[PDB]
Each structure stands twice: as structure tokens, then as C-alpha cells.
Amino acid sequence: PTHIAICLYYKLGETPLPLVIETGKDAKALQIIKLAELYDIPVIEDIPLATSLYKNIHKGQYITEDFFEPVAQLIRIAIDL
């Protein structure tokens, strides 16, 4: 889709792997991105990773092996802020 937003959740001890808790395309994606800023949640532009997550990991699912390293990196960039 033209717009994609993937919301990832990780909490040490609770989520063994990062969890996709919310997703959106097009209007809903734009709403997620705007509300994220409003609520001070880090938003990273990563076209390939967002696109592949959207295609492969549905809302409510843990990420799979192919995504472990790139998403771990994403989280550390976000957490480093």
C-alpha cells in the first residue's frame, strides 16, 4: 500500500520476541503516524522493513526469524533516543 505503519511492542520478560500489536495501511497508517507523534512514541522510516512486516506479520503475531535482527536494531535505535 502507499502508506504502512507497524506498531511493535517488546517488554523484557513478557514478550519473548517483539510483538506486532497494531498495523495500518493508507488512512489508518497515517492516523497511527500522527497519533504516535502526539503521544511521543518513536516513529522510524524504514521502507523495506515496514513493507515486509506488513506483508508477513499480522496484527497480534510475534515477528518471525527473518525479522529478529532488523527489528532488534530498530528497537535499539528507538531506545537509544
Binding site: 511493535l8 511492542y9 517488546y10 497508517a29 492516523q31 497511527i32 503516524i33 504516535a36 518513536p42 515496514a50
Partner: peptide
């Protein structure tokens, strides 16, 4: 019209990735 859970899910998120 957004679902009632959208805002809570965003606020809970560790990071959001976009295209």
C-alpha cells in the same frame, strides 16, 4: 472511524515503523 483501542495500542508501543 478509528477503533476504541487504537490510541491505547499506540501509547503502549515500543516503536512504530513506517514506509
Amino acid at each position: 472511524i478509528q477503533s476504541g483501542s487504537l490510541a491505547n495500542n499506540i501509547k503502549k508501543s515500543t516503536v512504530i515503523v513506517k514506509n
